Every structure is written in structure tokens, then in C-alpha cells.
């Protein structure tokens, strides 16, 4: 009310309203799902269009050969953060000849988002990210929120109606976690998960967007006729 003019102001109950308004931008965004087994990690994303004449907004971005994310909210903010991740992954490779740990990737994003919430003039990032990857400690899935909070999970979902997919994964936890050495089945589980967040619309060939990374699989994105298999 009087305490939402900028990010530098606390409310009387100890809330940061600008950070909460940034969180709101994610809820308006199109749904995206993340899940993993022990061998692979999968991102599924429902893409959104302006109208029938327009293209579908790309949700998934590659960060390295072993890491990438899906976005929900302000796309330009995801571009800034993904570019930062690309640089950090790259710094780790050039300087230490070392693939950046997915956990450190999260720690770096947390600290970059935080600085924008404690200083005058700036604003919080208006996007949520699901980071997947495969590093020296196996498969990983992270959830980034622009408050700074990063969380490691077996599965999750963000965006509009993400609660449906998040409930499904909470039921299916014991099943999909043990889908080891089988990419297509882990994707099927993810496609069935995102389907619990659909209303009136169904998954079409230029609507669905899938990405996968794992033990002997680089981070690759599937669009167009390449996802027709999973409909």
C-alpha cells in the first residue's frame, strides 16, 4: 500500500511487496514442468502465442552441454539470468577445466537476484526458472524464484495452474524417480504431468516444448515434429 513503492522498503509485517509483485508475474506465465530420475532430468514447457498468426514464445534455454533451464514470467529477465549462467558455467570451464555444479549454479542465481532486492533504483527479476542438469553427483532439478530462494527437488512446476502438475508429481514420486536408463518414459511422465495443468487447450505439435539431459545425453531441446511422438 504505502510500502510497495520500491524494493528497499519493508512493510510493517516484514514483507517486501515489490518482490511479491515480481512473484505475481510468474503466476501469469505459461506453465512449465521439471522432473528427474537418477540417470536423466527432464524439462517440459507449454509455449504460449499472441494469436494464430504469431509464433509460440520459446520457454527453454540452453546454458551448457550439461545444464539448462525453462522460464515462466518476463522473458527478457530470463535472457539476462540465463546469459549470466552461461558465463559462470563458461568461467568454470576455462579457468578450472571443471563443469559447474548444478548446486553452485543455484547459489550464484540466488545471490544475483538478492542484490536487486536490497538496493534503491533497481528492481527484482520478474521471472521463475527451473534449472536441470547432470554433473558429478548425478541428475539435478532446481527451482529458482526471484526473491532469491533456490530449492533442489525431485520434481516441480511453475506458472499458471502449476498446482495440478505439482500434485501429480507428488503422487507419482515413487514411480518416475526409478525411471533409469529410459529417456522416452521419463518424458512421457513429464508430458502426463503438464497435462494436469491444461484447460480447454490440448498439447499440439507447435505448442509443446521438451528438453532433456542425462548420463550419456547432452542438454538438447525438442520442438516441432520432434515432439509428435509424445502426443
Amino acid at each position: 500500500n504505502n510500502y510497495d513503492g520500491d524494493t528497499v522498503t519493508f512493510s510493517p509485517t516484514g514483507r517486501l511487496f515489490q518482490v511479491e509483485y515480481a512473484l505475481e508475474a510468474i503466476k501469469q506465465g505459461s506453465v512449465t514442468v521439471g522432473l528427474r530420475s537418477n540417470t536423466h532430468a527432464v524439462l517440459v514447457a507449454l509455449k504460449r502465442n499472441a494469436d494464430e498468426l504469431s509464433s509460440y514464445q520459446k520457454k527453454i534455454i540452453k546454458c551448457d552441454e550439461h545444464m539448462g533451464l525453462s522460464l515462466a514470467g518476463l522473458a527478457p529477465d530470463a535472457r539476462v539470468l540465463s546469459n549470466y549462467l552461461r558465463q559462470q558455467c563458461n568461467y568454470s570451464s576455462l579457468v578450472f577445466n571443471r563443469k559447474l555444479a548444478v548446486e553452485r549454479a543455484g547459489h550464484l542465481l540466488c545471490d544475483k537476484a538478492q542484490k536487486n532486492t536490497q538496493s534503491y533504483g533497481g528492481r527484482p527479476y520478474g521471472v521463475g526458472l527451473l534449472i536441470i542438469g547432470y554433473d558429478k553427483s548425478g541428475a539435478h532439478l532446481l527451482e529458482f524464484q526471484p526473491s532469491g530462494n533456490v530449492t533442489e527437488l525431485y520434481g516441480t512446476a511453475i506458472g499458471a495452474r502449476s498446482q495440478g502438475a505439482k500434485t501429480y508429481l507428488e503422487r507419482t514420486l515413487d514411480t518416475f524417480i526409478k525411471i533409469d536408463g529410459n529417456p522416452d518414459e521419463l518424458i512421457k511422465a513429464g508430458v502426463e504431468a503438464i497435462s494436469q495443468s491444461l484447460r480447454d487447450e490440448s498439447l499440439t505439435v507447435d505448442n509443446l516444448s521438451i528438453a532433456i539431459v542425462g548420463k550419456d545425453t547432452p542438454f538438447t531441446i525438442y520442438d516441432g515434429e520432434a515432439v509428435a511422438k509424445y502426443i
Binding site: 520500491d6 528497499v8 534503491y120 533504483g121
Partner: protein, 244 residues
């Protein structure tokens, strides 16, 4: 942050006016009146000191009339402290020109640059404008004798006779009435004093409440002399015109 406390000094009103410039002009309108009159053979500068106290040291005092160089002087109306900042800048600018070209600075060039500084404070920087209006009186070999005025907006114009500060409306009407083009310095001296004597808010115009200066070619052959009048010299010129 600090946005909360920003007055925004360099913005437009809905009517397309600059708030701070308009309010600075309102400030200047309460300052002691200063008059400049340009004659064919010289220029007069006359100014009224702000309500004087009897224990003020009058002879070793400078409030209104300042010397910029040997050929140019200014009469001040507004905040004296603000004027001195600008005067020192103008003095330096005149010496830069002389150092560069080995010639005394043309009057308009000095006026334009000082006016350009004022303009800057109205368009950028977020600072309050200078609450000062000048009357420039000077000579150069291009245009001869010249009178200019500048104000907080940074706009300047040339004049045959002009007043700044308090009661300019009344003062300008009186000057417009009695001024003519073939006028001499001695006549202009009389006009300047007569005008102040009628427009003054004081009971009677006396030597101790005035500053006076002339810029004549009254020196020996083709050269200009600046005369900043002493207290006794103002006392004499006031008697000679029959005001006291």
C-alpha cells in the same frame, strides 16, 4: 530512497513555464532597483542599496556595482552571494579570451556565456537557479557602448535604457518618457537619479543609499574610463542636479 525529497527544480509547469525561474524572478523583484542608461558618449549605472543602517561602513562597501574588466561593469539585483559566484566566473572568462586572442572580450560574448551558465541550471543538474539579474554596461570597438540584461532563465536582451529589481514597471515608463537618442552622459546621469528618486520606496533619496558608476570616453583621446563613484562624489552629483 532520496526521490521522496527531490523538488525537481528543472521541470515545466502545465502552462509551459519553469517554476523555479518564475519564483527566482519574484525574489529579484524585491531587490533594490538598478538602472542602466546608454548615451551617445557614455553609459550610466545607478543602483539603490537595500535599506541601509547608519552604522554601515559606506565608503569601503560594494553591494550593487561590480567591475568585470577595464571596459565592462555590471549592476546586480537579487542575491549578492549568487552574483559573486557568477561575477568571478565572468572575470575569469574575460581573461581567458584576452589570453587566447590578445584582445579585450566583446561585450556580447561575455554576456552570452554568463547567460548560458544560467540556462544550464534551468535545464539540467537538479539544482536551484541563480537568483540574480544583471545589467551589463560596457564598451568595445565593434558596437561601441552597449547595455544588456540577463535573468535566471539565462535569456539576455540589449537596451538603450533599462531597469531591474524593484519597481521596474514604474521605472521603465519614466525612462521611456524622458529618454531620447541624441542624449549625453551628463543628461543620462540626471535621468537615472530622477527615476530612482521617484520609484524609490524610501522617504528621500540620499548619498548613503546609492551606488553610482559611469563608463565614458572622457579619458584622454580614444580610450574608455570606468568611474565608480565615491560617497562624496555621489553627494556632490545629488546636489548638482537639485535632489538634495
Amino acid at each position: 530512497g532520496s526521490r521522496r525529497y527531490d523538488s525537481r527544480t528543472t521541470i515545466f509547469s502545465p502552462e509551459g513555464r519553469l517554476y523555479q525561474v518564475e519564483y527566482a524572478l519574484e525574489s529579484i523583484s524585491h531587490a533594490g532597483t538598478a538602472i542602466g542608461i546608454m548615451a551617445s558618449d557614455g553609459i550610466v549605472l545607478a543602483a539603490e542599496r537595500k535599506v541601509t543602517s547608519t552604522l554601515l561602513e559606506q565608503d569601503t562597501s560594494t553591494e550593487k556595482l561590480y567591475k568585470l574588466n577595464d571596459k565592462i561593469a555590471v549592476a546586480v539585483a537579487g542575491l549578492t552571494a549568487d552574483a559573486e559566484i557568477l561575477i568571478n566566473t565572468a572575470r575569469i572568462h574575460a581573461q581567458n579570451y584576452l589570453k587566447t586572442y590578445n584582445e579585450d572580450i566583446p561585450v556580447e560574448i561575455l554576456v552570452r556565456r554568463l547567460s548560458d551558465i544560467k540556462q544550464g541550471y534551468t535545464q539540467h543538474g537538479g539544482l536551484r537557479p541563480f537568483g540574480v539579474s544583471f545589467i551589463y554596461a560596457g564598451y568595445d570597438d565593434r558596437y561601441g557602448y552597449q547595455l544588456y540584461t540577463s535573468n535566471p532563465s539565462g535569456n539576455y536582451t540589449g537596451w538603450k535604457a533599462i531597469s531591474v529589481g524593484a519597481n521596474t514597471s514604474a521605472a521603465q515608463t519614466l525612462l521611456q518618457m524622458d529618454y531620447k537618442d541624441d542624449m549625453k552622459v551628463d543628461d543620462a546621469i540626471e535621468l537615472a537619479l530622477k527615476t530612482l528618486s521617484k520609484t524609490t520606496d524610501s522617504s528621500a533619496l540620499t548619498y548613503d543609499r546609492l551606488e553610482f558608476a559611469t563608463i565614458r570616453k572622457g579619458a584622454n583621446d580614444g580610450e574608455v574610463y570606468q568611474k565608480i563613484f565615491k560617497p562624496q562624489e555621489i553627494k556632490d552629483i545629488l546636489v548638482k542636479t537639485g535632489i538634495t
